[PDB]
Write a protein that binds this ligand. Sequence first.
Ligand SMILES: CC(=O)N[C@H]1[C@H]([C@H](O)[C@H](O)CO)O[C@@](O[C@H]2[C@@H](O)[C@@H](CO)O[C@@H](O[C@H]3[C@H](O)[C@@H](O)[C@H](O)O[C@@H]3CO)[C@@H]2O)(C(=O)O)C[C@@H]1O
Ligand SMILES: [Cl-]
Ligand SMILES: [Cl-]
Length: 138
Amino acid sequence: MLIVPYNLPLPGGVVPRMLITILGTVKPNANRIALDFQRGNDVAFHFNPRFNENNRRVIVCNTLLDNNWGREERQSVFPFESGKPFKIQVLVEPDHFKVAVNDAHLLQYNHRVKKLNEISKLGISGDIDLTSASYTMI
Ligand SMILES: CC(=O)N[C@H]1[C@H]([C@H](O)[C@H](O)CO)O[C@@](O[C@H]2[C@@H](O)[C@@H](CO)O[C@@H](O[C@H]3[C@H](O)[C@@H](O)[C@H](O)O[C@@H]3CO)[C@@H]2O)(C(=O)O)C[C@@H]1O
Ligand SMILES: [Cl-]
Ligand SMILES: [Cl-]
């Protein structure tokens, strides 16, 4: 297994046709998962499944610039389940991050941070057993 929080360097940042794959298992009674694609201290793409926000399950996505959170994008389709193995795939495309979970399309997040080649770390955190984190060019 890997230790969470886990930092995956993205050398030279991200670029279209880069596919990032995260395999793990959600802990029992999970509260959260987070993927943070960082540009230095900024977070270009924060992907944050929340298992109990006012007793609903929701994925919150956002960008952090100069320590300020932007306008949240919220997706109520929620494919994760406490206790269960998952696969998150993040495919970088020209205008957005495209996310699939367990081989099903979940959401897209338009690029707010434009300097894709400076988005050079992925932080993976939260209530998971992390098995693998990697990337490949497709
Ligand atoms: C790092 C740490 O110690 N704590 C958290 C922080 C803090 O709990 C928080 O910033 C203190 O106010 O929160 C972090 O998660 C935030 C992040 O997911 C953003 C994305 O937009 O949302 C924040 O919650 C919002 C909430 O969605 C709104 O409905 C509400 O009106 O405002 C909330 C606070 O801004 C999350 O707290 C963070 O990265 O800041 C995660 C850290 O682990
Ligand atoms: Cl970085
Ligand atoms: Cl930018």
